[PDB]
Each structure stands twice: as structure tokens, then as C-alpha cells.
Design a protein around this nucleic acid. Structure first.
Ligand SMILES: [Mg+2]
Ligand SMILES: [Mg+2]
Ligand SMILES: [Mg+2]
Ligand SMILES: [Mg+2]
Ligand SMILES: [Mg+2]
Ligand SMILES: [Mg+2]
Ligand SMILES: [Mg+2]
Ligand SMILES: [Mg+2]
Ligand SMILES: [Mg+2]
Ligand SMILES: [Mg+2]
Ligand SMILES: [Mg+2]
Ligand SMILES: [Mg+2]
Ligand SMILES: [Mg+2]
Ligand SMILES: [Mg+2]
Ligand SMILES: [Mg+2]
Ligand SMILES: [Mg+2]
Ligand SMILES: [Mg+2]
Ligand SMILES: [Mg+2]
Ligand SMILES: [Mg+2]
Ligand SMILES: [Mg+2]
Ligand SMILES: [Mg+2]
Ligand SMILES: [Mg+2]
Ligand SMILES: [Mg+2]
Ligand SMILES: [Mg+2]
Ligand SMILES: [Mg+2]
Ligand SMILES: [Mg+2]
Ligand SMILES: [Mg+2]
Ligand SMILES: [Mg+2]
Lengths: 56, 145, 29, 54, 206, 56, 69, 63, 67, 143, 142
RNA sequence: UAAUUGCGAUAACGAACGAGACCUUAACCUACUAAAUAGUGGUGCUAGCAUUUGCUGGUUAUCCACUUCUUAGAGGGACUAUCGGUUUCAAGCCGAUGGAAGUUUGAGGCAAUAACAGGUCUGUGAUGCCCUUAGACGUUCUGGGCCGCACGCGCGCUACACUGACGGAGCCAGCGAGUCUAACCUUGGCCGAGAGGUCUUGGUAAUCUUGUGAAACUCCGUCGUGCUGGGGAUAGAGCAUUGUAAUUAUUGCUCUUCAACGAGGAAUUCCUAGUAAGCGCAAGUCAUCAGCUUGCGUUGAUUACGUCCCUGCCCUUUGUACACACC
């Protein structure tokens, strides 16, 4: 999942994006479920600028 | 002005329907002390007796009471429609009465005991002491006395 | 419905005579 | 309800759709209406046209 | 006063002194003095009003509450205890009815009678709560001039509502009764009794 | 036909998302992205966006 | 009780008393007299014809009466 | 009742554990020199008239 | 309360630096000034930048200011 | 110079009007008229054992004066209040259906109102007469 | 008829009140009824206020007819005294004088309640969890 | 400072996320553009009432006019402005003037990092493992049950009445919804005391239902403080409506029945201004049913302009043998 998500980042970053984020949550390896976050660049989470800019 | 006096023509606490009427209140709200007489069934009877509705019980006459008796136990006669009567289409009889006086619960015990022998579920509830119109007895009416 | 209304047993005054168990008030874990 | 199932403090959302209607009245024949209405068009908009009177 | 007339009747009982002096329901605000200058500036007779209604902005500010035509400060204290909540149309009638009885028994200006009845029933010094962790002890203070107006109006209005509860008398009657019994303190006033029930207990603890 | 404009615009958006979801099922491997709907008073225009527009 | 009729001791007790009050209303007549207050309503309307009780204000609920002048 | 009035000079603290009492020092309305600090219940501002009983008192802090 | 954030201050601080002679003690003119020499995405944001930079002005016309 | 009914106090207007219709005696008020509550949500029959029907119907014509054409349901809603549901909340319940209608059916026999264009009921020329007439009669009753 | 005119309005809560101000013999009538027949009637002097402040005389050369929409019994009454008082500013704004105008705005403000100034207050919305805007539901705990 | 919000102090310097900005709504515009699905002036065809004329109603296409109210695109407007007082005469707060607007303008939307074995497998053809899979735990059909009542508790509705009830009379909103291979919102007419029935109809909707003629409230009158005509539980009897089907009363109507409740112990909840509370209406569910909810407006206050005492959260100091972190 790391070498999967990591590649998705650099792609999007090499795609001319101001920033990217990947959230992988689940059963990843074994037994207990845990979340893994992958983000690079710059991105804003807050106001209406979320509507017009971030695409999720 | 209603301010008239008279003298000794006034009598309070008279009996009606083998029950005893209040001395002074507006006659519609007076006769209602008899079970089987509501705030209206007295209002419509008093009108048909040509009695002043804004007179008081101790007033009127001795005979005006005896006419109020007639309209009460003969309600279908005096233009009072059937739907103003509690007894409409009385079971087996089919006739529209108005059960009055101390005769009210005697007729009530009658239909009660009637469907007690029918042994319908609605009646069994009465025998058990429960609610009949009912709905949820779960949280309600507890410490019923 | 015969034994139902013939039942002495089941009633209101019947249940109203004996009193409530201790289980009405109990909870947690 | 915000919440699927029943749990939590009771939290709702107000979802809004907004319809804006506006109309124009013109006098113009077959060589105008048929030509001007077909070419001027937008997705996300719904045009309509009226027979005379009724 | 050159009583002119125009395309509408503007009847005469109305058409009179409105341009001379500003009357109450019908009463004046001249010849009414505040009993003692403490609660002056905190009791407002000095900008007259016709009938007691306003668009209240009064609650926006701390002391803007003092700028109200106290009759209206009194009126609002009437609409409460449940079923009266929000109703000022039954309130102004309850005040106007009250004043007519006030100007029956004691004459004067019923608004100067309220001014008298208020200034009397505002407690001068008060008792407070101080600690010790359950051991109740009271260090006497002196309650603010503004609070005297607020506290008097309550006790007067609450005293009349209470005595008028299961009694046949009107709210207006008990309002005037309490107000006149407070014109000079008659000790029958509910607001008078509870007033000494503060001031007396004050000095006893200090 | 001829229903309220309140009801008409509702019925389109559902009909949009019904297809938008449907196209996201069959076309997933094909690199699907999003869809558009343009109603001309001739036919109806359903325009697809996709990464591999060849296999589509 | 409160004597909801008129006894002619009433009427005579009434008329030689009532104008003394400089405030009379629905409640007053049940207080200083023994009357029933529905008669106080019919009294004030009968006592209205002569200025024995002269009006001040009137409402379905309250109305004010001061001494005859 | 001897009483007296007092004009307000300045606001200082709000004492009491719940913070329901304000502190002020007051010119006597008679002697515009003399000033004694007092505690009050309701809200107070500069230039308003307090009716004191004990003309000395002055006890400062409360809990 | 009425405290102005840093984007405002850090702008108004840098406006007076390079624009001082062309800036005034009138807000409403400096408002119109802000739309010319500067670019501000929303109207309301501009008024605050003008409103502080005139407040920053009236102190710099009252004396030397530190920042 | 001149009067209308809009220059007249609403309640005291009907009084002079209603009793004048009770003086006139020609209405044909319905045969029941003592057994009805006027509203599904009114607990007791109207208190007036004399004509409330002249009282009511006069107000009907009064209201009819202002607006254009008003029907039975508009009137049964116009005459209405809250109905006590007992131990439940209050919902507003419209008046009796056979009253306001049968009122209007006895309001044409006086020539006061005529069945109207666009449906409903509108005042005629004669009703306008008696309306504006008793108006001044109660306007100049200041004596 | 032959008249020029000016028309203004006033608002209290959801009530809007429109007054037509033109020449005439001085008829003041709201909803086709005399100003004396507004029947909250305990508020009668509230709608009479805009007249008596400036004087009863100056309504002779001017005419006003009024109609009210929206609100409730009390909210409309506050709007008409705003409809009349702001109808008087205009007849003296255009048809006579500014010095004879400022002697209203200065005379109206000294008594101002509603009158020539608008009411800034509106209702505010309900949030979930309570029957009111601010108020919440009662809560249990244990 | 509402804010790690700023000012200052400064081995720190300069920026990013979150806050703020931003966005939605409610407030202002006699300035921009308009309008028969908005109104308003005017012109004609017509009544009443008084006649110098006036004043109030009626008539969409009878003709022409205006955009103030109404609608929404464009913008403008506030920035805490001006002034005063305090404080590093700093960020700031405080005061009055003006201002539609001066508690971030009121109310919201969205909302970092990280946490919980919180809830959800009974929203899902989202799901892993196990279970059952043909006399099934699939599915369907008939009936019952989920509502069953000695009782314990939580959200509530109705009340104890005279600042009321009742009976009449006065006629005032706003957010809304409404019928295709169809039966939705129902003005108007008639029949029925009522609930209703029927004949009509306008509208796919700023047109028509709808000015939703709503409720509280206002006014006149009736009752007279008496568990009273407050109160409406319970129960009887009859009439309608939904619906294959209403018995274990679906809902409504009418008559009679007329209970406890006379202001609620120790405890405890919600709330600072068009807010509390009172009051209804619309929509959600809905064939039928609201004592529920989401919103709406109506009537309109008491009291604060505070503190850290009770109850919690927040930082910093501090201590640890804890780190699966005081389960
Ligand atoms: Mg934000
Ligand atoms: Mg009855
Ligand atoms: Mg009742
Ligand atoms: Mg009514
Ligand atoms: Mg009820
Ligand atoms: Mg920083
Ligand atoms: Mg940020
Ligand atoms: Mg704008
Ligand atoms: Mg300054
Ligand atoms: Mg979030
Ligand atoms: Mg989140
Ligand atoms: Mg768990
Ligand atoms: Mg097998
Ligand atoms: Mg259940
Ligand atoms: Mg529990
Ligand atoms: Mg709860
Ligand atoms: Mg009383
Ligand atoms: Mg009533
Ligand atoms: Mg509306
Ligand atoms: Mg009783
Ligand atoms: Mg519903
Ligand atoms: Mg059900
Ligand atoms: Mg629910
Ligand atoms: Mg605070
Ligand atoms: Mg605070
Ligand atoms: Mg603490
Ligand atoms: Mg608590
Ligand atoms: Mg150690």
C-alpha cells in the first residue's frame, strides 16, 4: 500500500497539482484495522475554497 | 334591568328525577346535577319549555319544572333530533331513548352485563378491571385506586 | 374466552394484591 | 439525519436545490424563432417556446 | 388652540390638548416629582409617553434599561407567570384600568403614585452570600440604585399577581391596591413586607 | 409528461447520478471519469469523459 | 352563602349604602355587600340609569365607578 | 432614620466568590471631600446615588 | 472581538512602506486606492486592509511607528 | 358630506344592522337555529337565545361589502377559532357547513347579495344601500 | 383626477405599509377606513402619534390613504406611523422646503420610536435540538 | 483576542495547515435593468352614499403611463468610521455622534492534527470469517405479535383557572407543498347540526388552491371563586372517513358519563433580545393516524454586561516505577 499510494502522489504532483492526499484505511496487513495517510505539496481543508479547488 | 325582587315565591333545593337540584344556578347549569343531563341536553330542554334561560333555578314556577320533566323523558317528541340523544338505536330495541336520572348506570350495567355473557374481548376487559378503549396499559393509569 | 373470563387467577385485583418484584429497578453491566 | 442508524446527538442537514426561472416575451416569426432558439442553447438550462395565445 | 379640521373628522376629545401638553392615557408628566433624588436618572418620568408601548431597544445596553418610561418597565413585569407571556395588549389595559382606580382613591397623578410606591419599596441595603463551605454567613451590602427600581417593580407586580390569584379582584385592582398601600407604606403591601425583610436582616448581619 | 419544473429538475439529477454511477461500474477499467447531459430539443446528448477513450 | 337573589332587605340595604363608596366595581359589591357579583353586574347596570354610581371606564372585564356627584 | 446619600467616584473591583458585588468609593453628597469604600448589589456606574446606612463600614474583600 | 488578523496587518504594514506618499488619512479614498495598486480577491477583505492602513497612517502622521 | 360603512365602527355597526334585520322579521332563518353550535370546534351553542343569526348574517353581509366574491368555505374558515382536542394540542377547525351557506341562501331573499361572477357571492346594489344607510344612522347617532 | 404625488412606506417585522401622499383636504385613512377605526384600539394613540407631534394643522394641504400587508395586529400599527411620518418628509422634501423639512426630522427624532427611522430587528432561525432559536431540548443524563 | 487573535519581548528568521478570510441567509438602496405570472398612478365602460366635486367598491387586455412597496441579475455600503477616554499613550478595549447596519452586523455552512475497540453488518447487489441453505435462518401466503400490565425510569401533551372559561364580535402571518402512460392542492354550488357527501371546477403553478381570512391576541357579553360552567381521564351509544380488512376501540363527529389535578418533596433542564416563554401554520412520515420532528412566522419580555463558588474543558508548571499510557 505504501509503494502504491506513494506512486499516486508523485504522479499527481508531477501532474502539476498544488498538493495531493491519499488515505488508506482498513485491514491492510493483518488483524487490527489501521489508517495510513499519504500527502505531499500544499492543500487547504477549510472554507468554500474547498468547494472550488480540492477534488476528492 | 333584571333587578326584580318578588318575596316568598322563591324556593331553593327542589327534587327532580328522584335527585335533588341545586337551589340557585342558571337552570341549564342547574339540572345538570342529574346524571344523564349535560351542559347542552339541559340547554335544549330549557329552550323547549319556554323557560328563561337566564332565570335561576329557585325562580320560574312549580309547573315549569314539571314540563321540563316531559321534554327530558320524551325527547323525540319535542323536535330534539335523534343525534342529541345518547341512547340512539338501543341494542335489540332499535328505538332512540335518553337514559336519565339514576337510570343511567342501570342501563350502563345492562349493556356491560350484556356483552359479559356474549364473552366478547371488549367485555372481558371490563371483568378483569382493565381498559377497554384501552391502548397501552404499559405505563399508564398505575396506582389506579 | 370462556376460561379467560372464568379465570380467577388472572385479573387486576389479583395482581394488585401481591407486590412488585425487585427486578423493576435493576440495570448496569 | 446526519447519522445513519440512530446513534449520537441528533444532528441534521438542510440540503438545498435552487431553481431560478426567468422569462422573456418577444414578437418574431418563423425565420427568427426557429433560427435564434436552436443555436443559442446551454446545458444546465431548459428552454421553451409558446404557441400564440392559448 | 385654533381647533382646525380637515377631510377626516379627527374627533374633539382627541382633537384637544395633544398639541398643548403630552398627556398619558389621560394624565400629565408635569407636576410629578421623584420622591428622592437617588432613583432619579433611574426612574424616567422626564420624557412623557401617551400610552405605554414602545419598540424596545432597551435591552441591548446595560443602562439603556434605565431610559424606559417606567410605566412600561412596570407593564412588562405584568406579562409573566405562564399564560401572560408575550401579551402587552392585555398588559396596557391592565395598567390603564389600574391608574383610573389609583386616581379614584388617592387622587394626585397615578404615575406619581407609582413613583411614590416604587421609591418606597426599593430596598436600600441588601444582604449577600459569602463562603465558608456550607456555613451560611451574610455581609451586608447596599443594593444599587438601578436594582432598587427593578426589585421594587417586581415585588409590587408580583405582590399584586399573587394576591389576585384565586381572588375575584382584577389584576388592575390588586395592582392599584398594592400601589396605593405602597403610596405611603401601609405594611399590607407585599412589596413593603419583603422590603423590610431585606433591609432589617441586612444590618443584623455586618 | 409535462410535470412541475420542481419535479423535472429533480428527476434529471437522479437520472444523471443513476447513469453517473452506472458508467462508473461497467467502464471502471476503461479509465472513466465523469459524465455530462445536454438536452437539446432534438435527441439527448450524453457526453462521456474517459482516460482510455479507445477501449470505450 | 353570597345571596344570589334580591331579598328587598338587599334592595333597601343597597340603595341607602352604595353611593357612599368612592370606588365601586364588580368585586366591591361582593365585599362591602354580601351580593353574588352577577347581581353586582346587573346592579351597576341598573344603578347606571341614575348617576348614583357615575362611570369612569368600561370593559367586558373591568369598569370603574366613583361616588355620585 | 439618619441615613445619607453618596455620589459615585470610581469603580474598582468586583468581589465575592460568584462575582456578584461591585466595589466603589463615594463622595458623601454633603462632604465632597470625604470618601469611603462600599460594596453594592446591583450594577453601578460613575455618577449615581447610593443610600448608605452605616456611614463608616468599608470592609473590603468578600468570599 | 475587533482584532484584525495578520494577512490584513502584514498587508497594511507593507502598503505604507512602498505607497506612503500616495496614501492618505481618508479611509474611503484609500479604499479606492486599494483597488488600484493592489489586488484583493473579495470586497470585505479590502476594507479591513484599508481600514488598518489608514489607522496605521493616522499614527504615522502622529509619530514614527515601529514595524 | 357623505358616508360609507367603512367609516363605521365594526361591532356597533352590526348591532344597529342586525337588530334592524330582527325588527324587519323577514329572513327565513332555519328551523333549528337553537340546536347548533355554529362551529365543529365550539363546545356550546351560541349564548344569545335571541337572534344571533341576524347578528351573524349581518356580519356576513358586512364582510361581503369589503371584498369581492366569497363562498361558503371561505366563510366557514373566516368564522372560526381553535378547537380544544382535550388532552391534545389545539388545531383550528372551520365552522359549521350548513350555517354560513344557509345564511347566504337567506341573504338573497333580502336582495342584499346576488350570486357572483367568478364564483362565490358578491353584494348587490340594494345591499349597498341599506349598508351605507344604517351607517350614517349610527354615524349621526352622536345626536 | 388631477394630482401630482409622492408615496413612501414603512416596515415592522414582516409588515409592509404603503401610504399615498398627494394634495387634498387632508383625509387620513388606512385600508379605506378612517384613522379612528384602527382597532387594536389600545394602540390608537400609537398611530395618532405622527400627527400630534408636528401639530394637527399641517395635514390640511396634503392627503394620505394607507394600506398594510404582512405582519400582525401590532406590527402593522408600527408600520403605518412609519408610513405617515415618512410620507410627511417627502411632501416637505419636494413640494415646500428643506428648512421646513429639518423641522420635522428634528421634531420626529425627539419623540422617535419607529416613525421616520426603520426597525432593524427581524426574527432569527431555529436550530435543531430546541423548540426555539436559542432554546434547547431538556436533557436527561441518568 | 471569540481565536497560537494580535501587540510587544525576542537566537531566532521567513512562510504553510487550522482560526480568519472564504460561502449561505436575514437586515439598507426614491441610485442600474424591468415586468401581466409583481404591483402602483392614470384613462375609459358601472353601483352605493352625500351632491359644488368628494369619498369608497366593482371591470385584463378598454387605452396609455411609473418601478416606491413586490421579484433578481448588476453592484454599492461597514472599515468598528468620526470624536472622546483610558493602555507599551502598542495590539486593544471603553464612551458618546452619526449610521439601515457598530457583541466577527445577527444566524448559519465548511472546518487542522490526533484520539475512541463510541455507533452502524437491521440503509445498501459495500464487505471478511463463521453459520443456515430445501421439513431453509431463502421466499411467500393466512392469522397473531411488536400495543401484551402489580411496577421502576426518560422525552412530552393537557391542566389546576377570573392576566380565566365560555358565546359571539373584531380578521393578522411566514417558511411552504401540490395530478402521467394520472387521481395531487381543491376555490365555487348544493345536501347534512356535525363529521361528511355531491356537483363543479383553477392550477405541472409568483397565475390556481392562498391574502392559506392560521393561533395567541382585540372587543361586547355570559358565568362568580364554588374541584365551578376550571379540568377533560374514563366509559356507554349512535353517525361518517381511510382502507381487502379497523375486533385488541385506525381517524373524525354527536350525546351522555365528569376521575385525578387546589401549583407539585429531595433533586434537575433550557436560556441574554425580536431572544425566554406564550401561540399556531407549513412541510417530513402518510392510503389512514402527531401529543414527534425539521423549519416558519405571530404576540413579546424578566434579569446579567459579571465571576471562578458548584460543574466541566483549555494551556503552563510539577511529579511518575505509567507508554497495552490509571480499564
Ligand atoms: Mg471558516
Ligand atoms: Mg353536552
Ligand atoms: Mg371546556
Ligand atoms: Mg370568533
Ligand atoms: Mg385541550
Ligand atoms: Mg506564526
Ligand atoms: Mg488558514
Ligand atoms: Mg447585494
Ligand atoms: Mg480613538
Ligand atoms: Mg468535521
Ligand atoms: Mg469531519
Ligand atoms: Mg464496544
Ligand atoms: Mg438434502
Ligand atoms: Mg416498539
Ligand atoms: Mg429509563
Ligand atoms: Mg431526548
Ligand atoms: Mg382575579
Ligand atoms: Mg374568546
Ligand atoms: Mg403571505
Ligand atoms: Mg365540575
Ligand atoms: Mg401530516
Ligand atoms: Mg398507528
Ligand atoms: Mg419521530
Ligand atoms: Mg459570559
Ligand atoms: Mg463574557
Ligand atoms: Mg473551576
Ligand atoms: Mg447543569
Ligand atoms: Mg520524585
Amino acid at each position: 500500500i505504501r509503494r502504491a499510494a506513494y506512486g499516486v502522489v508523485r504522479y499527481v504532483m508531477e501532474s502539476g497539482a498544488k498538493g495531493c492526499e491519499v488515505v488508506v484505511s482498513g485491514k491492510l496487513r493483518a488483524a487490527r484495522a489501521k489508517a495510513m495517510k499519504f500527502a505531499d505539496g500544499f492543500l487547504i481543508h477549510s472554507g468554500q475554497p474547498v468547494n472550488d479547488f480540492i477534488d476528492t | 334591568s333584571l333587578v326584580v325582587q318578588e318575596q316568598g315565591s322563591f324556593q331553593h333545593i327542589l327534587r327532580l328525577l328522584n335527585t335533588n337540584v341545586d337551589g340557585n344556578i342558571k337552570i341549564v347549569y342547574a339540572l345538570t346535577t342529574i346524571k344523564g343531563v349535560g351542559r347542552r341536553y339541559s340547554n335544549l330542554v330549557c329552550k323547549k319549555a319556554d323557560v328563561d334561560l337566564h332565570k335561576r333555578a329557585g325562580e320560574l314556577t312549580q309547573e315549569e319544572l314539571e314540563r321540563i320533566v316531559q321534554i327530558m323523558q320524551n325527547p323525540t317528541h319535542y323536535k330534539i333530533p335523534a343525534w342529541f340523544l345518547n341512547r340512539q338505536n338501543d341494542i335489540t330495541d332499535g328505538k332512540d331513548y335518553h337514559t336519565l336520572a339514576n337510570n343511567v348506570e342501570s342501563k350502563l350495567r345492562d349493556d356491560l352485563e350484556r356483552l359479559k355473557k356474549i364473552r366478547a374481548h371488549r367485555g372481558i376487559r371490563h371483568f378483569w378491571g382493565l381498559r377497554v378503549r384501552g391502548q397501552h396499559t404499559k405505563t399508564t393509569g398505575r396506582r389506579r385506586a | 374466552n370462556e376460561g379467560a373470563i372464568r379465570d380467577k387467577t388472572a385479573g387486576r385485583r389479583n395482581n394488585r394484591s401481591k407486590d412488585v418484584t425487585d427486578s423493576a429497578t435493576t440495570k448496569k453491566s | 439525519r446526519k447519522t445513519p442508524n440512530g446513534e449520537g446527538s441528533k444532528t441534521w442537514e438542510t440540503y438545498e436545490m435552487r431553481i431560478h426561472k426567468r422569462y422573456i416575451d418577444l414578437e418574431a416569426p418563423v425565420q427568427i424563432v426557429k433560427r435564434i432558439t436552436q443555436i443559442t442553447i446551454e446545458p444546465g438550462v431548459d428552454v421553451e417556446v409558446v404557441v400564440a395565445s392559448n | 388652540f385654533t381647533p382646525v379640521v380637515l377631510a377626516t373628522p379627527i374627533p374633539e376629545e382627541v382633537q384637544q390638548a395633544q398639541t398643548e401638553i403630552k398627556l398619558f392615557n389621560k394624565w400629565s408628566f408635569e407636576e410629578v416629582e421623584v420622591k428622592d433624588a437617588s432613583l432619579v436618572d433611574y426612574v424616567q418620568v422626564r420624557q412623557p409617553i401617551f400610552v405605554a408601548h414602545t419598540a424596545g431597544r432597551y435591552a441591548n445596553k446595560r443602562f439603556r434599561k434605565a431610559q424606559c418610561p417606567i410605566i412600561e418597565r412596570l407593564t412588562n413585569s405584568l406579562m409573566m407567570n405562564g399564560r401572560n407571556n408575550g401579551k402587552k395588549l392585555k398588559a396596557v389595559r391592565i395598567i390603564k384600568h389600574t391608574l383610573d382606580i389609583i386616581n379614584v382613591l388617592t387622587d394626585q397623578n397615578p404615575i406619581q403614585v407609582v413613583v411614590d410606591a416604587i421609591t418606597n419599596t426599593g430596598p436600600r441595603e441588601d444582604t449577600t452570600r459569602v463562603g465558608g463551605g456550607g456555613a451560611a454567613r451574610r455581609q451586608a451590602v447596599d443594593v444599587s440604585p438601578l436594582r432598587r427600581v427593578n426589585q421594587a417593580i417586581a415585588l409590587l407586580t408580583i405582590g399584586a399577581r399573587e394576591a389576585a390569584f384565586r381572588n375575584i379582584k382584577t389584576i388592575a385592582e390588586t395592582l392599584a391596591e398594592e400601589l396605593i398601600n405602597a403610596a405611603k407604606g401601609s405594611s399590607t403591601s407585599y412589596a413593603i413586607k419583603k422590603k423590610d425583610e431585606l433591609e432589617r436582616v441586612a444590618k443584623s448581619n455586618r | 409528461a409535462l410535470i412541475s419544473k420542481k419535479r423535472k429538475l429533480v428527476a434529471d439529477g437522479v437520472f444523471y447520478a443513476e447513469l453517473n454511477e452506472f458508467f462508473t461500474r461497467e467502464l471502471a477499467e476503461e479509465g472513466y471519469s465523469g459524465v455530462e447531459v445536454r438536452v437539446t430539443p432534438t435527441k439527448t446528448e450524453v457526453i462521456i469523459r474517459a482516460t482510455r477513450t479507445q477501449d470505450v | 352563602q353570597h345571596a344570589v337573589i334580591l331579598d328587598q332587605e338587599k334592595y333597601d340595604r343597597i340603595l341607602k349604602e352604595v353611593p357612599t363608596y368612592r370606588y365601586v366595581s364588580v368585586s366591591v359589591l361582593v365585599d362591602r355587600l354580601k351580593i353574588g357579583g352577577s347581581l353586582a353586574r346587573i346592579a351597576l347596570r341598573h344603578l347606571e340609569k341614575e348617576g348614583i354610581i357615575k362611570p369612569i371606564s368600561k370593559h367586558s372585564k373591568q369598569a370603574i365607578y366613583t361616588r355620585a356627584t | 432614620t439618619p441615613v445619607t446619600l453618596a455620589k459615585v467616584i470610581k469603580v474598582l473591583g468586583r468581589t465575592g466568590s460568584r462575582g456578584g458585588v461591585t466595589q466603589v468609593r463615594v463622595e458623601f453628597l454633603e462632604d465632597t471631600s470625604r470618601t469611603i469604600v462600599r460594596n453594592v448589589k446591583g450594577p453601578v456606574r460613575e455618577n449615581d446615588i447610593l443610600v448608605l446606612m452605616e456611614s463608616e463600614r468599608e470592609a473590603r474583600r468578600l468570599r | 472581538g475587533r482584532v484584525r488578523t495578520k494577512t490584513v496587518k502584514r498587508a497594511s504594514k507593507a502598503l505604507i512602506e512602498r505607497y506612503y506618499p500616495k496614501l492618505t488619512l481618508d479611509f474611503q479614498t484609500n479604499k479606492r486606492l486599494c483597488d488600484e495598486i493592489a489586488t484583493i480577491q473579495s470586497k470585505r477583505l479590502r476594507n479591513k486592509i484599508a481600514g488598518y492602513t489608514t489607522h496605521l497612517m493616522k499614527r504615522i502622521q502622529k509619530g514614527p511607528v515601529r514595524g | 358630506p357623505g358616508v360609507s360603512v367603512r367609516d363605521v365602527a365594526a361591532q356597533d355597526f352590526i348591532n344597529a344592522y342586525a337588530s334592524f334585520l330582527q325588527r324587519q322579521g323577514k329572513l327565513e332563518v332555519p328551523g333549528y337555529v337553537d340546536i347548533v353550535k355554529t362551529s365543529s370546534g365550539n363546545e356550546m351553542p351560541p349564548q344569545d337565545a335571541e337572534g344571533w343569526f341576524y347578528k351573524r348574517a349581518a356580519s356576513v353581509a358586512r364582510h361581503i361589502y369589503m371584498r369581492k366574491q366569497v363562498g361558503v368555505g371561505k366563510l366557514n374558515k373566516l368564522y372560526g377559532g381553535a378547537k380544544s382536542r382535550g388532552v391534545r394540542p389545539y388545531k383550528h377547525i372551520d365552522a359549521s357547513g350548513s350555517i354560513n351557506r344557509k345564511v347566504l341562501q337567506a341573504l338573497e331573499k333580502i336582495g342584499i347579495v346576488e350570486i357572483s361572477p367568478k364564483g362565490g357571492r358578491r353584494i348587490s346594489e340594494n345591499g349597498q344601500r341599506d349598508l351605507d344607510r344604517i351607517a350614517a344612522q349610527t354615524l349621526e347617532e352622536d345626536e | 383626477s388631477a394630482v401630482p404625488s409622492v408615496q413612501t412606506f414603512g416596515k415592522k417585522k414582516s409588515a409592509t405599509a404603503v401610504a399615498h401622499v398627494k394634495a387634498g383636504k387632508g383625509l387620513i385613512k388606512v385600508n379605506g377606513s378612517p384613522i379612528t377605526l384602527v382597532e387594536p384600539e389600545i394602540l390608537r394613540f400609537k398611530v395618532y402619534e405622527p400627527l400630534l407631534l408636528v401639530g394637527l394643522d399641517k395635514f390640511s394641504n396634503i392627503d394620505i390613504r394607507v394600506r398594510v400587508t404582512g405582519g400582525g395586529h401590532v406590527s402593522q400599527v408600527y408600520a403605518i406611523r412609519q408610513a405617515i411620518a415618512k410620507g410627511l418628509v417627502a411632501y416637505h422634501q419636494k413640494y415646500v422646503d428643506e428648512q421646513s423639512k429639518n423641522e420635522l426630522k428634528k421634531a420626529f427624532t425627539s419623540y422617535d420610536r419607529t416613525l421616520l427611522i426603520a426597525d432593524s430587528r427581524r426574527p432569527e432561525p431555529k436550530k435543531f435540538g430546541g423548540k426555539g432559536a436559542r432554546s434547547r431540548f431538556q436533557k436527561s443524563y441518568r
